[PDB]
Ligand binder design. Structure first.
Ligand SMILES: CCCC(=O)SCCNC(=O)CCNC(=O)[C@@H](O)C(C)(C)COP(=O)(O)OP(=O)(O)OC[C@H]1O[C@@H](n2cnc3c(N)ncnc32)[C@H](O)[C@@H]1OP(=O)(O)O
Ligand SMILES: CCCC(=O)SCCNC(=O)CCNC(=O)[C@@H](O)C(C)(C)COP(=O)(O)OP(=O)(O)OC[C@H]1O[C@@H](n2cnc3c(N)ncnc32)[C@H](O)[C@@H]1OP(=O)(O)O
Ligand SMILES: CC(C)(COP(=O)(O)OP(=O)(O)OC[C@H]1O[C@@H](n2cnc3c(N)ncnc32)[C@H](O)[C@@H]1OP(=O)(O)O)[C@@H](O)C(=O)NCCC(=O)NCCS
Ligand SMILES: CC(C)(COP(=O)(O)OP(=O)(O)OC[C@H]1O[C@@H](n2cnc3c(N)ncnc32)[C@H](O)[C@@H]1OP(=O)(O)O)[C@@H](O)C(=O)NCCC(=O)NCCS
Lengths: 164, 164, 164, 164, 164, 164
């Protein structure tokens, strides 16, 4: 199948952190971060897929270090895994000084056709070491995400029964 | 000291406005995550009786598309209490006001950490369920928690690698 | 056909963000009114089992200042059911998560009208209280309703005069 | 006491109604209207008072005619009554063609000093007929607002008892 | 066919809040520009008697910092009428309610084009001044118009050239 | 002291949604301008190594309508370095993910000034280009700078004159 580099659809974001972006302890609101993460990931996935996409799941968001008033942020997003119709997008959130990693997130997107049906996406390959790390560690993440979906179906059925 | 899941359980009924949705009239994943985080944090704060921070979004499963004009019900509760951490589960339902029936649109799990005035992790009360759904989430929590703990290991591996 | 006040009762737990407050860190009256209207409409829709429109905001009493960082609980319910109209009462409380205690920050009464698919006023179910607070608002509704009806007269006088 | 004309602090607003401002039946959201109303009223009150102000209450908002996608709106706000430290602001919302009155609102504001204590405001006088209508009909509205406050205190006490 | 400059004059009043400012309490240029575009568009729309689009924004100089708590009045009117295009002049004033002071902080010029339902440029009424200030803007418009028209060519050229 | 133009280059990616457009699916100029100002400021801040303020925005020509669903890439870099001031050039491109097409829709120039903690203008590093496109902007900057500097005088004059 047609292949793309991870760099090819890679997206960047630069953002300032203002007092209105943080709580009274000067820590940036998680919701704002989450909104930015999803936004940049969706564009990256659309670029890789060459089609419209939908967020299937947020696999994880880890908040490693507090982001503070006055900090400058750089977001880096890229496709780290390509299934048949699905993509894993990895998003790094760094505090710009040289850069410190403030947060790490993985999301899964599904490409859709004009009919709204899942559509095939190109494969992806890394070119430099970091890209290779994310590419190499993805299959394990994917398998875990799949196991979690399996368990989730049990909960959904229980919750559907709870309503009747 | 222990609290019931009901003591800190939180609800939110919300309309989905155009500012919340994309060009396909589907609610932003980022916005949903921000709303989820917002209500979950309040639940965690109520349970801990102290300030909290979002440690992670463990997962968000986007089950059914949420559309402009939909009515949503968010339900959040503490399903697990560690030493300093809490798992909050958030159910996001699409309310059918005409038929008094609701569809589960999304399911999310998050981890919060309670802090003292000095800003260091602080002990939280234990938690216990009382009704069936509470018991379902409470009973299935240990397996999720083990996964979260497993993820932390990998995040640390990636951080360690990225420091290059 | 009659419904209990509990059947359509709605809740909202919300954090107050900087985007919601002025330079004195006080929440906008307009924003509070928008949130009030939003939750009240959902309650009215649930009760009517049909689409609704806001006929009027009968009053909003701003009792205690709401500040950036506050946690709010909104509670909305139908306190009166006319032929096509409903009175919805909304309580806005400031939650003290530390002490599990809340202060009443604002009180509001609104009138909604149910509509059919053709867009004309439509009959709504009757309403009855079950617990003490519900009974309080239900019992005091007739006096408020007479005031609202009295106001309509004056609004019509003013409209009639303004047509000049 | 020092006196100001109603025209002296009068404020205007012109706004377009876009599809994103209206629901699926092309009717403008009440919350947006309410937000604009409070915003313009607060500025009018500040201008009249020559000081910071707070919204004491929203005395009423009547939605007389549906506002639709593509409509052009004009807001007119002015002080129609001046107590000792308080002001009534009347806000007219018109659909611009010659103009049709879509909504009518009355709010009460309280002027505060730098210490945050209620402060005396100038008196107000009308100059043209419409201003005179609003000025002339105010005392009755004020008295009704006062009677309503009296009743509200009973509810607040009941709700405060309900919590213990 | 001719209209006065005052006939289509539009207003917007808004105060500057902390969420609108940087770390030192200075208003964002983008917020100001968004507001300018909004009010100018309404004026142009009213004068044209049809939908409009922004063809261009002339430069804007920020001479003095606009600060948290400042109250701004935006005033817009048509200063020139071409065939299908209009120059809109927007005055941005700081209202100092405390001292009854009204200072002009910034001046902005924009060009709007009237369009028909087919989306094609449409003839507009002409415009005429009535007082000295209106006449000043009216008199100085032609030079600005000829310069921006030349500038459009320069812009097209630069874009075409860079696409290489 | 010198920095490359690429060294402080900043990015922002955002798609155009219905809430961002007028009745005919065309993007608001104000939204574009807000985005431009945001990304330019971050670039200037990074290059300066200090806080910055927008001194001015050169004119912007809207040559082609930006439409609902378009994906925009904002790219900002410093094209000129004065003593305390910088010219920031912002390219706005429409990414067409479907066809792997990247077209330059608009170009914008802004002037930023670096300030010290006292709020006084501060010396900035110089800037140098490395590739042809950077060099083009670098080469054409002085003319733009001298013209805007003259224009500031004109702006001050006009404001001083109108205050009469
Ligand atoms: C309400 C206002 C909005 C906000 O402030 S929240 C927006 C999120 N923004 C942030 O900046 C959060 C930054 N993250 C941090 O500060 C973290 O390091 C945090 C949560 C304080 C933990 O600090 P540490 O020094 O690592 O403490 P610790 O290692 O002993 O762990 C304490 C408990 O927290 C858990 N934890 C830490 N990191 C986690 C993670 N990524 N995901 C899930 N769980 C995590 C950890 O398992 C531990 O649990 P327990 O105490 O054994 O029950
Ligand atoms: C959820 C999406 C957001 C929205 O659409 S709501 C934002 C508000 N925007 C609007 O455009 C509402 C416009 N207002 C209207 O359309 C009204 O005329 C309305 C409510 C439909 C009533 O239409 P009418 O032709 O006058 O019908 P009607 O005179 O027979 O009265 C029907 C019931 O409604 C009541 N009512 C009408 N106007 C009212 C008012 N200002 N304040 C309080 N109550 C009012 C009226 O008392 C009557 O009650 P009942 O049926 O006897 O129980
Ligand atoms: C995913 C969705 C589009 C349809 O689900 P579906 O019918 O089960 O799709 P399919 O069964 O045909 O599976 C096809 C792909 O979807 C992936 N997928 C489906 N659900 C997933 C989930 N919870 N998590 C991760 N991947 C998922 C599958 O892995 C598969 O990818 P692959 O074949 O490349 O391996 C829908 O459930 C959904 O996501 N609604 C939410 C709307 C939304 O996301 N709004 C906010 C962001 S736009
Ligand atoms: C009103 C408030 C400032 C303090 O109330 P208070 O202590 O009772 O004030 P006072 O008893 O000293 O009364 C002084 C004035 O307030 C007026 N007032 C007080 N409560 C009022 C109410 N519910 N409705 C109308 N007027 C009221 C009184 O009429 C009086 O005016 P007057 O002397 O000119 O006739 C406070 O309760 C409040 O409004 N908090 C809400 C914050 C807010 O409004 N946020 C959104 C908008 S900024």
């Amino acid at each position: 199948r047609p292949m793309k580099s991870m760099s090819e659809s890679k997206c960047y974001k630069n953002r300032q952190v203002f007092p209105q972006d943080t709580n009274h302890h000067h820590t940036m609101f998680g919701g704002t971060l989450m909104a930015n993460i999803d936004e940049i990931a969706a564009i990256t996935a659309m670029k890789h897929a060459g089609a419209q996409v939908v967020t299937a799941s947020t696999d994880s968001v880890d908040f490693l270090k507090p982001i503070k008033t006055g900090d400058i942020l750089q977001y880096v997003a890229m496709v780290s895994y390509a299934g048949t119709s699905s993509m894993e997008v990895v998003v790094q959130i760094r505090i710009d000084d040289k850069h410190d990693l403030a947060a790490l997130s993985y999301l899964t997107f599904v490409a859709l056709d004009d009919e709204g049906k899942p559509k095939h996406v190109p494969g992806v390959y890394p070119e430099d070491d970091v890209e290779k790390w994310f590419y190499d560690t993805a299959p394990q993440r994917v398998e875990r995400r799949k196991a979690r979906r399996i368990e989730s179906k049990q909960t959904i059925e229980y919750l559907a029964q709870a309503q009747h």
